[PDB]
Design a protein around this ligand. Structure first.
Ligand code: YIY
Length: 293
């Protein structure tokens, strides 16, 4: 089932961006703020059809909603994420918003719920392959995460993918582990390396991982490091990550609070492979202690 939309019913506004193919503009349709993906060359037709068949096969609260599509000319109608991407929220232009440990943990749970859903696809699992914060959009005051694919990814790539190896849906698990580190620390992974992308590939292939987080709870540290293991078969499945993350949310109240506070940013270079979290874990420890201790 595909909701047919006539191009005359759409009021195309400003260009938002350009992915591997097509053009994404902001648009209006049925008294609502929408996103349109349109074709620029007759070459990208085959690629539009592939996108249209995959976007219309998927239905989950954490995967970008396709509203419908135009046929003449070919155009995709999507929900609009006013909050922009997660990368923009974390590392974008000033003023950047303040966020809590509950926000960081919720975003990652929602990402795992969306990926577990993709991995459960019948008759064949859907592997994202490009899980990273520029591919994650935020809605509902930055409280609700939506997985996208816009077509540099080195920092989040599992080493078996870039090594040429025949990989599995476990490459997404690796990518999720990196994003988890990223939302907790509010740092760009492997930013200190720099240079071209192959320098990141070289380090990660040689065993390099993001630095350890000071005062990071052991249940979270243990989950993070398993996700980024060299052996993909040692990484937990997304269903397990969903289960563990859902259980940990009990100690992370306040995820439904909108992002509305401005943050002032200072990033000191971490020494001895150890960094400070951006988020505060004092409340997690207090709430864990009431239950355990
Ligand atoms: C189901 C998954 C795996 C997450 C997937 C998503 C996807 N495409 C999109 O997400 N496209 C898209 C998403 C959002 C969008 O509009 C925006 C913009 C920025 C802000 N708000 C809305 C315009 C296009 N996919 C895709 C992309 C290219 C080819 C293809 F076959 C599938 N695949």
């Amino acid at each position: 089932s595909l909701h047919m939309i006539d191009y005359k019913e759409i009021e195309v506004e400003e260009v938002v961006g350009r992915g591997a193919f097509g053009v994404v503009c902001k648009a209006k349709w049925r008294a609502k703020d929408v996103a349109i993906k349109q074709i620029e060359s007759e070459s990208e037709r085959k690629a539009f059809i592939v996108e249209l068949r995959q976007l219309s096969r998927v239905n989950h609260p954490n995967i970008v909603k396709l509203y419908g599509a135009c046929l003449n000319p070919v155009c995709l109608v999507m929900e609009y994420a006013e909050g922009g991407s997660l990368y923009n929220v974390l590392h974008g232009a000033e003023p950047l918003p303040y966020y809590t440990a509950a926000h960081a943990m919720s975003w990652c749970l929602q990402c795992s719920q969306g990926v577990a859903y993709l991995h459960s696809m019948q008759p064949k699992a859907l592997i994202h392959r490009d899980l990273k914060p520029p591919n994650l959009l935020l809605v509902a005051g930055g409280t609700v995460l939506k997985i996208c694919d816009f077509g540099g990814s080195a920092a989040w790539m599992a080493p078996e993918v870039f090594e040429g190896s025949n990989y599995s849906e476990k490459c997404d698990v690796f990518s999720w582990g990196i994003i988890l580190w990223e939302v907790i620390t509010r740092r760009k992974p492997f930013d200190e390396i720099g240079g071209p992308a192959f320098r990141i590939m070289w380090a990660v292939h040689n065993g390099t991982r993001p630095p350890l987080i000071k005062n990071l709870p052991k249940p979270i540290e243990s989950l993070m490091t398993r996700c980024w293991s060299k052996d993909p078969s040692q990484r937990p499945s997304m269903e397990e990550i969903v289960k563990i993350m859902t259980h940990l949310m009990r100690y992370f109240p306040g995820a439904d609070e909108p992002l509305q506070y401005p943050c002032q940013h200072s990033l000191p270079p971490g020494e001895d492979g150890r960094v400070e979290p951006y988020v505060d874990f004092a409340e997690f420890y207090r709430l864990w202690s009431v239950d355990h201790g």
